[PDB]
């Protein structure tokens, strides 16, 4: 009955755990997306972007996946490519955390390292350059704009939250990288299940481009340490229309918070999980949110961050 034909189908069904040392009388609950193949929420879009591209005919046997990503999406696409028998090339600055170069190499990824001083843009340039060499051979999935990103969250992540809270969820707090998570979850709960919850996007105070944009202020991205969020631009897969509130969190507090999750709750989450919880804790301690059930996405697990600043 419940046997997955390959690892890409085993995505999701991640659990909700109530926090004891955050929030007020258990109003803060976390969704542990570290409980996923490849250990992050991105396993969901890794799978669905491939599935959709197959259904569309844009991805077929023989064709190669090419994309730029220096985060969890590369690991997600790698495991999906391996599971379903696609060749994959990932471009990323030559400033990767070796372990990730090995993890990816171990997954069969053709690593193309670009110059670091170029950063992501360097890498995306090389990706598109490689796609240009034979557009018939290479397909780029484009996580920041590919609608299959938020769609998978609308079909799985959102419905899991609804079901596990028995529709009692009042607030969703999620860090924004591509925006896919908050977008899909919000669409699911507000539009499909019809409940007017509060959707809270989280971003680094160091690079608060969503806050600046919505305020009509000058957009000034900046460097930060909250891996997975703060892209420094507004991605196409962030639907600003469903965002009710934006909370900013600083890198040190995000880090301190992730450490508290481990030491105090026995929850092994990544830096961005600490950021999401710090924002949620702030809301949870406002009297306006006292009798509200707040669900916080924890995007990844902490062992992906041994030798960062977390440990």
């Amino acid at each position: 009955m419940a046997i997955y034909a390959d690892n890409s189908y085993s995505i999701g069904n991640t659990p909700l755990v109530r926090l004891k040392h955050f929030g007020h009388n258990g109003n803060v609950v976390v969704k542990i997306e570290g409980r996923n193949p490849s250990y992050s929420v991105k396993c969901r879009i890794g799978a669905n972007m491939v599935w959709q591209a197959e259904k569309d005919g844009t991805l077929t046997k023989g064709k190669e996946i090419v994309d730029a990503t220096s985060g969890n999406t590369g690991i997600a696409l790698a495991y999906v490519a391996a599971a379903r028998g696609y060749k994959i090339t990932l471009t990323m600055p030559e400033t990767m955390s070796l372990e990730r170069k090995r993890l990816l190499c171990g997954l069969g990824v053709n690593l193309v390292l670009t110059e670091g001083a170029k950063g992501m843009k360097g890498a995306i340039a090389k990706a598109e350059e490689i796609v240009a060499s034979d557009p018939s051979r290479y397909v780029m999935l484009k996580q920041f704009e590919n609608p299959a990103n938020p769609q998978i969250h609308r079909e799985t992540t959102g419905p899991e939250i609804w079901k596990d809270t028995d529709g009692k969820v009042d607030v969703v707090v999620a860090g924004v990288g591509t925006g896919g998570s908050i977008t899909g979850i919000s669409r699911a709960i507000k539009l499909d299940f019809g409940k007017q919850i509060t959707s809270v996007a989280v971003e680094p105070v160091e690079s608060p481009v969503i806050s600046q944009t919505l305020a009509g202020e000058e957009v000034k991205p900046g460097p930060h340490k909250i891996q997975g969020i703060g892209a420094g631009f507004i991605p196409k897969n962030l639907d600003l229309s469903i965002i009710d509130r934006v909370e900013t969190v600083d890198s040190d507090t995000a880090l301190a918070t992730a450490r508290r999750l481990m030491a105090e709750e026995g929850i092994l989450a990544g830096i961005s999980s600490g950021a999401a919880v710090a924002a949620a804790d702030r809301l949870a301690k406002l009297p306006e949110f006292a009798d509200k059930l707040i669900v916080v996405i924890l995007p990844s697990a902490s062992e992906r961050y041994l030798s960062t600043a977390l440990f």
């Binding site: 985060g71 690079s207 460097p223 997975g228």
Partner: peptide, 8 residues
């Protein structure tokens, strides 16, 4: 640090 889509 992370800038312009880096680390995602």
């Amino acid at each position: 640090t992370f800038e312009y889509g880096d680390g995602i």
